Amino acid sequence: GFESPRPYKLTHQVVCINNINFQRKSVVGFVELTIFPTVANLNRIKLNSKQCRIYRVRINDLEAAFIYNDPTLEVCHSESKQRNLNYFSNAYAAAVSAVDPDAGNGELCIKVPSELWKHVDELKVLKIHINFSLDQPKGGLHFVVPSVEGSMAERGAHVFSCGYQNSTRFWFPCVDSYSELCTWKLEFTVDAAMVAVSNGDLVETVYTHDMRKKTFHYMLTIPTAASNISLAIGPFEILVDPYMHEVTHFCLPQLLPLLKHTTSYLHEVFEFYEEILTCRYPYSCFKTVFIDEAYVEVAAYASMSIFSTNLLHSAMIIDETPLTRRCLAQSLAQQFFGCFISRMSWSDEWVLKGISGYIYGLWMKKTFGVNEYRHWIKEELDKIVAYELKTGGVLLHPIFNPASHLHFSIKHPHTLSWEYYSMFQCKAHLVMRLIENRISMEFMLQVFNKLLSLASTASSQKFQSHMWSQMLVSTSGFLKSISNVSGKDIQPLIKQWVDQSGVVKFYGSFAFNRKRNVLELEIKQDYTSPGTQKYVGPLKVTVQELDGSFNHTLQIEENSLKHDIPCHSKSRRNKKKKIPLMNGEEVDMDLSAMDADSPLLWIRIDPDMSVLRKVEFEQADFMWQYQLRYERDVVAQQESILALEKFPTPASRLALTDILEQEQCFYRVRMSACFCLAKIANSMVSTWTGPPAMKSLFTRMFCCKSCPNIVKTNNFMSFQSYFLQKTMPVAMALLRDVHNLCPKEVLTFILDLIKYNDNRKNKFSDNYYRAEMIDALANSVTPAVSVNNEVRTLDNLNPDVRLILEEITRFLNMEKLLPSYRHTITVSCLRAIRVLQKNGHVPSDPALFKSYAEYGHFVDIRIAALEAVVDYTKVDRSYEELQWLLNMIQNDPVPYVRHKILNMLTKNPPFTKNMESPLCNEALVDQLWKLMNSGTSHDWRLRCGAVDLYFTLFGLSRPSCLP
Amino acid sequence: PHELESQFILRLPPEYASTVRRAVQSGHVNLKDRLTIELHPDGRHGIVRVDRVPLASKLVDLPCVMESLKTIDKKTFYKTADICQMLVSTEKKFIWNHGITLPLKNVRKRRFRKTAKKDVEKEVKRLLSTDAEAVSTRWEIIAED
Amino acid sequence: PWNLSNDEYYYPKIIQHSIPAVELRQPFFPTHMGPIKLRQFHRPPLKKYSFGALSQPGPHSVQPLLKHIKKKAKMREQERQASGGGEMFFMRTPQDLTGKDGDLILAEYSEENGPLMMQVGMATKIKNYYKRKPGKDPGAPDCKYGETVYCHTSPFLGSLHPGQLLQAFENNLFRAPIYLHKMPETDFLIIRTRQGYYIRELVDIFVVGQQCPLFEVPGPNSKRANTHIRDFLQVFIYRLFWKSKDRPRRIRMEDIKKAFPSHSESSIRKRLKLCADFKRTGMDSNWWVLKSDFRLPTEEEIRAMVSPEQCCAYYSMIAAEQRLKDAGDDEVRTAPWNTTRAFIAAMKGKCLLEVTGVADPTGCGEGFSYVKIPNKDADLRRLSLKNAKQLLRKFGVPEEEIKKLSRWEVIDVVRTMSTERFSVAEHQERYKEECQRIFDLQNKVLSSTEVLST
Secondary structure, three states: OOOOOOOEEEEEEEEEEEEEEOOOOEEEEEEEEEEEEOOOOOOOEEEEOOOOEEEEEEEOOEEOEEEEOOOOOOOOOOOOOOOOHHHHHHHHHHHHHHOOOOOOOOOEEEEOOHHHHHHHOOOOOEEEEEEEEEOOOOOOEEEEOOOOOOOHHHHOOEEEEOOOOOOHHHOOOEOOOOOOOEEEEEEEEEEOOOEEEEOOEEEEEEEOOOOOEEEEEEEEEEEEOHHHOOEEEEOOEEEEOOOOOOEEEEEOOOOHHHHHHHOOOHHHHHHHHHHHOOOOOOOOOEEEEEEOOOOOOEEEEOOEEEEEHHHOOOOOOOOOHHHHHHHHHHHHHHHHHHHHOEEOOOOOHHHHHHHHHHHHHHHHHHHHHHHHHHHHHHHHHHHHHHHHHHOOOOOOOOOOOOOOOOOOOOOOHHHOOHHHHHHHHHHHHHHHHHHHHHOOHHHHHHHHHHHHHHHHHHOOOOOOOOOHHHHEEOHHHHHHHHHHHHOOOOHHHHHHHOOOOOEEEEEEEEEEEOOOOEEEEEEEEOOOOOOEOOOOOEEEEEEEEOOEEEEEEEEOOOOOOEEEEEOOOOOOOOOOOOEEOOOOOEEOOOOOOOOOOOOEEEEEEOOOOOOOEEEEEEOOHHHHHHHHHHOOOHHHHHHHHHHHHHOOOHHHHHHHHHHHOOEOEOHHHHHHHHHHHHHHHHHOOOOOOOOOOOHHHHHHHOEOOOOOOOEOOOOOOOOOHHHHHHHHHHHHOOOOOOOOOOOHHHHHHHHHHHHOOOOOOOOOOOHHHHHHHHHHHHHOOOOOOOOOOOOOOOOOOOHHHHHHHHHHHHHHHHHHHOOOOOOHHHHHHHHHHHHHHHOOOOOOOOHHHHHHOOOOOOHHHHHHHHHHHHHHHHHOOOHHHHHHHHHHHHOOOOHHHHHHHHHHHHHOOOOOOOOOOOOOOHHHHHHHHHHHHOOOOOOOOHHHHHHHHHHHHHOOOOOOOOO | OOOOOEEEEEEOOHHHHHHHHHHHHHOOOHHHHHEEEEEOOOOOOEEEEEOOEEEEEEEEEEEEEEEEEEEOOOOEEEEEEEEEEEEEEOOOOOEOOOOOOOOOOOHHHHHOOOOOOOOHHHHHHHHHHHHHOOOOOOOOOOOOO | OOOOOOHHHHOOOOOOOOHHHHOOOOOOOOOOOOHHHHHOOOOOOOOOOOOOOOOOOOOEEEEEOOHHHHHHHHHHHHHHHHHOOOOOOOOOOHHHHOOOOOOOEEEEEOOOOOOOOOOOOOEEEEEEEEOOOOOOOOOOOOOOOOEEEOOOOOOOOOOOOOOOEEEEEEOOOEEEEEEEEEOOOOEEEEEEOOOOEEEEEOOEEEEEOOOEEOOOOOOOOOHHHHHHHHHHHHHHHHHHHHOOOOOOOEEOHHHHHHHOOOOOHHHHHHHHHOOEEEEOOOOOOOEEEEOOOOOOOOHHHHHHHOOHHHHHHHHHHHHHHHHHHHOOOHHHHOOHHHHHHHHHHHHHOOOEEOOOOOOOOOOOOOOOOOOEEOOOOHHHHOOOOHHHHHHHHHHOOOHHHHHHOOHHHHHHHHHHHHHOOOOOHHHHHHHHHHHHHHHHHHHHHHHOOOOOOO
C-alpha cells in the first residue's frame, strides 16, 4: 500500500520549451500541471524548482502568488564560525530534507487563490500554469557549444539533461520524486537543422510559420515520474536499428560509422532481457543518444539512454568492445527495473539496484561465460569487503540516524558520498545473488516477472493512481511476492545482509587426525573489527581428497571452534588411478609433493561465495599448488595465485609457469600468474638459475622460431594470447636484480619489443598493446642515485633512462601527428613521465601536465594530466598547484572533470589529518568550508565530493590547524 | 488435528451415470438432493439413490493402487490421497479383479502374481486360544483318512 | 569479444514438497505402523466415523464441487494475479492438500507393490521425453500436462524411437513411464470427510509402468535403516519441544511412547539424555525439561536432519518386511532393498541385471526384473570341400554359405545342419537388446486402448 506524502495527486504534466538559445545558453518555457487535491483546504501547493526564474504562475487561469526559497544554496550561514564537519552534515541533511518532495515539502510554495477554495474543498481539478526561464544554467542541463564558427548545427552544439536521481528540478518545475507518476506531454521548439530527443513517442513534428524552427511533440502515456524525464537537443545523425525498428540511435555528426558498429549488438541484449523475464520491453520506443562532455558514462531515463561518445569504437578496436557492450547492457537493465518499476521511498532503492545489477550479471554470464561471471562476482565482493572494512559499512534498507559510523547522512541520495553510492549498488546486486542462492533462479525470475506484470497491468489504466502505484515496488511487497512464489521467506537472510550493515571475516586452519581419519577444521571469526559482524548460519566447505571432491555443511554457532568432518580412503595412491575432480572429469596428478598420511589435496571454505566474506585459510604450499593446477573453479585458481606469493619455493614457480603455458586455462588467471611469478622471482634472487622469468616463455609463445629476439608480426585475432602478450612484459618489467635495479636483459627485451613491432597485417588496432609497452617501460624505472641533491640534468642522466626517455618522446610526438583511439599512448606517456619525475630522473616540473590539463585536450588526456598534478602537489607540497586545482574545481566547463579532480584529491590527498604540513592554514580551511557551503551548490556531486575532501583532510572534528 | 481425506470411486449404471454427470457439470445444489449415498453397517453394501431411484451397491477392493494428484500449474503434481476402493452400483465377492483403465483388465489374474495369500493367521490365533482354554492337546501330522 | 572462458575443460558437461511433507507432520508421515496397517500399506480402508455427520446412520446427500472449485482455484489465480502471474508456490497448509480444489488427475500403478511410493503431500513432475526424428522433425507432439525435454540418452532401460514422445513421472524417489488414458464414462470421485460426501468428475487417468528406482531402500536393521529410526525419533522429539508452551520447554515421555510404541524406552531415554533432563520433584515434576545450555535447532536444521524420501524408503522396507514375514530365497530377491540396490548399481555400470527372472512384478514376460548378474571330425575333413559343397546344396543351405567357398566354415555348417569368443560385447549387447524389447512390450501394453475380454 502506497499513501502519498503530498496532499495532492498529479495526473498530467505538459512541458513546453521554446527559444533554446545556444549563444546565450538560455531556455524559455512553461509547465502546466494537472493536480487533484486529496485533502480539502489544500491552500499552499509545494513544487520543486532549482535555477529556474519563475515569471508567473496561474492556477485555473487565475493569478496566484508564489514564494521561492532554496535552503540548499548556502547550507550554513556565512557568519557562523563553526568549522567541524558533523555540523555541516547535519545542516546539509536538514536542508535537503527541507526541499524533499518525499516529505510534503518543496522549494516553490504557490498559494491557492481565495475564489478557488470552494473548488478545492470538494475535491476538483486544479491546472497550474507556471512559465519559467533558465538564464544561464549551472549544471541544470549542459550546453556543449564548440567555438568553431558557422551555424549551431555546423559547429556541433548540443544540450542534454545531466544529473543523478531527482535532478529534473534543475531544468523545469516539477514534483521531483520517484513516487509521483503522471502522464506527460513534451513539446520542444528547436532549430530546423536540429533534432530534439526525449521520453515517450514522437507523435508529430510541425514547422514554424517562418520554417526556421520546428516543434517536436512527444507523448508519454506510460505514467513515469518527473525524475525519469530527459532531453537531448542537437544536430544528431539518426540511425534506425536494422534489426529492431522501434530503436533509433542518435550520434554526433561525423560519427555515424562508429555508431553503426557500436550499436549493432543491442538487439541481442533486448532479446536476452525479454527472454529471461517474460515481459516485452514496456515502452513503445527506445532511443540511445551519444553526446560529448557527459555527466556519467551511461544514464538511463524512461524510454531513453544517454551515453558518452567515448564509448563509440570502430570494428578494429578491441579492449573497448566488452566495456561498451556491458554499458549498453546495464542501461537496458535499468530501463526494465529503474524506470518502469520505480521506487516507493528512498528506502527500497536496494531492491531496484539489486534487480538491475543481478539481471545484468545474468546477461554477463550468458554473453561472456560463467568464468567471466565468477571473476566479476569475486571482484565485486573483494571491492565491498575492502570498502566495508575501510569505513564502517553499507546499509541497504535503513529505517528512519541508522548509520552513525560514517560522516554523511544516508536519508537522501544527494547527501551520499559517490563511493558509497557505488558500493551501495554493488552490495545490492550481491545480496540479490544471495537471495537467488537461497531461493532458486527460476523462482527469482518468476518474482521479477510478477513485478513486471503487475506494473504492466497498472501501466494501461487511466485511474489517477488508484492503480498506478502498483508500478512502485517496496521491500515488503518484494518479500511478499517472493513468499508468494516460493513459500519460503528470506527474513533471516534479509535481517543479516540487508538490515545489519557488515561483512564477515573467516580465519581457518585445519589438522588431519590420522588415527580416526578425520579432518579437524578450526574456523574463528574476527567480529570486533569496525566493519565486521558475526555469522551464525551454515557454511559450505569443499574438500578435495584422493577419492574426489566432497562438500560438507558446517554449523558455525557463536561458541563453535572445532569442526570434525570425515575423510575418505587413500587407495588412489596405492594404484595409480586418476583422481576425480569437482566436475565429472578426472586427471593425473603428481602426488610426490603430497603428505603420505593425509588423503586430502585441498580445502576451500565457502567456495560458492554464499556469504559476504573474506576468507584467510592456512593450507600447506603444495595444497595451494594443487589447487592452482587442477581446480575447475576460477576463483579458487585466483585465490591460490594470491596465496602463492607467500611461498616462494621453486615448486610454486613451476606451478605458475605451468599455468602460464596452459591454454584452456581462463585468461585472467594467467594474467594474474604473470604478476605472481614476477613477485616470486623478485623474492628468490640469488637462487634463480637461468634467464629472467617469462622471457623464455615469451619467446616460446609470441616470437619467431628462427629469431628469438625478434617478435612475431602482430596478429591479434585470438583475443586471449593478445591479452596475455600485452600483459606479460608489464609484469616482466617488475623484475629486480641483486642491487634492486631492473636488469638490462628485460629492459633490452622490452625495447626490442617496441622496435620490431609491425601492425600492418592484423585487422585490429595496436593502441592498447603499445600503451601497455609504455607501461612496461615505466615499470622498469628504479629510483636514481642523486648525490648531494645534484640538479638532475640530461648530462647526469642514467644510461638506462635515456633510452626510455627517447622512446616515450618518440611515442608522444608520433601521437601528436598520428593519434591513437582514445589517446591511449598520450595517457601512457604522461603516466610514464610522472613515473620518471617521481624518481630523481626528470626535473619535478608540473608545466607539461598543466598544459595537457587545458579544456581543449581530451577528457582522458585531461584526467591523466590532472592525476599527475595531484601527485606532484602531494609530493612537492606545492601551494600554488593546490590553488590551481581548487580553482579548476570551481570553474571548469566539464562537470565530470571537476568531480574527477575532487575524487583524485580525495584518493591521493595533499595531507591527511595526522600530518603537519605547510598547507594547513586557516585560509585553506576557509576555502574548503566555502566550497562545501557555497560554490558547489549546483551539482549535488561536487558538494559530496567536497564533504569527502574536507573529511579526508581535516576529519570529523574541528580542524586542529585553526589559529 | 488433520485427518487424511478418504476418496473412493463411484461407478454407476451408464444412463444413471449420464444423469449424474450432467447434474455435476451443471453445478447447482439441485444435484445434492438428487444424489444420496447410504452405506450399510455391513461395510460392503449400500444404496446409491439417483433422482430418488435406489440402486444396489457393493464396496469392492481394487487390485492396483491409485493416487489422486492435484496441480496448480500442470507441471508439478502433489499427491492428495490413495484410492483403493470402489462403490460399484447396479470376502472374495468384495475383491475386484480388473483395474479401472482399459489396459488393466484381469490384472489380478494375469499381470499380478497371487502373492497376497499368506484370515489363516486369525484361524491359527483361534486354534491357539482353544488350546489355551483346554487341558490336554494331542497332535499328529496325518495321512489319507 | 568472444567467450574466452575455457568451459569445456572446467565444466565438462528440484522437487519442492508441501510444507506438511517437508516438516514430516504425523497424519501424512506416520511414526508407527502396526501389522494390520502394514498389510494395508497404501490401501487405506474406508473407516467408520464415531462422531460427525456421517457417523449417524442413514442416507447422506453428496455435494457436487464446481463453484467451490471456481472460488478456490480462482483464489490461487487471484493470489497469482495479485502477486503478478507466474507458476507460484501454494501448498503451505494441510488444507491446501485437499481434493476439493485444483485440477486432479488419477495415477494407477501396474505393479501390486512398488519398490518406492510417494506419501501424501509429496510432489512429482511430469517430463515428456521426446527423441527428435533423424534430420528434420516437426516438433514434440504437444501434451496437456508436464514439460517437454529432448532426450538423446534414454532415461529408462530401453531407448526411445525417433519421433517417440514418452511421458514420465519424475521425482527424487523413482522415474516411471506413464500413459494417459481417458476415464471410464461411469466413474466419479467421491471425497468423503466427517461432514459429508463431495463429488468430482475425473477426465484424465495415467497408467504408471514399472518404476526405475532412484533411491535405495535400506535393508532391515541395517546402518541406514536404524540411523533413519534414530533420526526420525530425534526430529519428533525436537518438534515436540518446539510445540511446548511452557518456558522451560518441557515434554512428557508418554507422548513419545504413544507415537513410537514399539520402541524400547531405553532408546527414547537415550535420545532425551542429551538435550533434556527429568525433573522428579518441585515444579516441572514428571516432565523432561529442555537443558538451558542446549540450543534447540532451527526449522531448516530439523528439515536437514530427515528427508521425506528417506521416510518413504523406510516405509517400503517395513511393509516388505511384513509381507515377507507373513509369507513364511526367490521372494527375498524381490524385496525392494535388493531390487533398488540392483537397479542403482546397474545405472552406475557396476553390474548387469537379468531382465527375465523372478523379481518380475508382472509374473509374465512383460516388465523387468532388477536382480544383479555379473558383467562377466575325421570323415568331415575327408568331405574334401567339393562333396561338402554338393551336400550343402542337398540339405537346402542358402547359396551364400555355399558361395563363400570357405572350407572351414562349410564343414562347420554341414555339421550343424546334420545336427539339425568373448564374454564382453556379446553378453552386454544381449542384455541391452533384451531390456529394450521388454521396455517396448511394456510401453505397448500401457498404450493399448483395445478392450480386453473378462
